């Protein structure tokens, strides 16, 4: 009855007793530096705890992945606990999600509602593979970041895979948006300053599910009722005017995406089945992400939208 992400975050906060302190510091940095897209840069995470910096600046800091685990989860939870958004994608939509068109602008992934969203795609039956160890992907966090490749600050989108395991690898995977380049350019042809490739292919795979939160006209429902993108970007966290402290949600806001569409598809399949149950002497054309460019006003833009499933009878 309590989501696994919340349970694991609550566990972390308990086991690393300095967690609440670090979030407050992050909050302080946020309010002062007023970042436009991110909430708190990953780079700055050594500052939050002094013991972590002391153990991270020994030879063995970038070698110890447990410290990087701590820092990654501080960076992630600190941004995520202010909104606690969980977006469950519908079956009949997850299936039709395949890789996006390769010239989609990165810029459209600057349109997330919150600083960090958790996307639930366990109905995709996608797994993650590492050295003989295969793990089912329950979901993933998309969280913003501001990074410094020296002298320059870029807008990066980080992905954190959730496999619901004790040894989950929470180390964020970056995907630079600040460039004018499309998804293909960055991810595919290695133009990014991040060239790890395994991470880049993993990100590309994640992209088609994350797109729903960046569309101008989302099928988001909260508890069965439509959410306008206007209402979705409304603030959740409350800031105290005298103290400066943050008031955060006690429970997550679990949304559903593509549920009208899913129901429609379920009903189409129901007609097919009914026809086959009465045997008298009728198919679904699957939906898909569709990309195109209006290319008007001289400014070149690439538009992607969901082309829905269609009952062909």
């Amino acid at each position: 009855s309590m989501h696994h992400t919340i349970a694991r975050m609550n566990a972390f906060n308990k086991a690393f007793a300095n967690a609440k302190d670090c979030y407050k510091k992050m909050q302080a940095w946020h309010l002062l530096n007023k970042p436009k897209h991110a909430f708190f840069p990953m780079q700055n995470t050594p500052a939050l705890d002094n013991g972590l910096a002391a153990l991270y600046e020994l030879r063995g800091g970038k070698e110890d992945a447990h410290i990087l685990s701590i820092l990654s989860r501080l960076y992630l939870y600190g941004a995520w606990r202010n909104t606690l958004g969980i977006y469950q994608l519908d079956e009949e939509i997850i299936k039709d999600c395949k890789e996006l068109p390769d010239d989609t602008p990165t810029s459209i992934f600057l349109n997330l509602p919150d600083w960090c969203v958790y996307v639930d795609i366990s109905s995709a039956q996608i797994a993650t593979f590492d050295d003989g160890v295969a793990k089912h992907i329950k979901g993933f966090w998309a969280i913003y970041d501001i990074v410094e490749m020296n002298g320059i600050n870029h807008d990066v989108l980080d992905f954190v895979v959730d496999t619901d395991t004790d040894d989950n690898v929470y180390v964020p995977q970056p995907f630079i948006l600040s460039s004018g380049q499309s998804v293909a350019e960055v991810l595919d042809y290695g133009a990014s300053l991040f060239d790890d490739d395994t991470s880049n292919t993993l990100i590309k795979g994640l992209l088609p599910y994350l797109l729903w939160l960046c569309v101008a006209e989302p099928d988001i429902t909260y508890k069965g009722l439509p959410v306008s993108r206007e209402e979705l970007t409304r603030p959740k966290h409350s800031i105290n005017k005298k103290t400066g402290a943050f008031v955060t949600p006690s429970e997550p806001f679990i949304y559903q995406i593509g549920e009208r569409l899913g129901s429609e598809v379920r009903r189409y399949q129901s007609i097919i089945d009914g026809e086959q149950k009465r045997n008298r002497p009728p198919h679904i054309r699957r939906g898909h992400w569709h990309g195109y460019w209006q290319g008007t006003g001289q400014a070149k833009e690439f538009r992607v939208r969901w082309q829905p499933a269609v009952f062909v009878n």
């Binding site: 993650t128 089912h136 490749m149 020296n150 180390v171 300053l193 790890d196 993993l202």
Partner: peptide, 19 residues
Amino acid sequence: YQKMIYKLLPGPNKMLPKV
């Protein structure tokens, strides 16, 4: 258990890129 995962993605690295 035969109804299962059919897609594999490369597991994320446990390091952060230089920077």
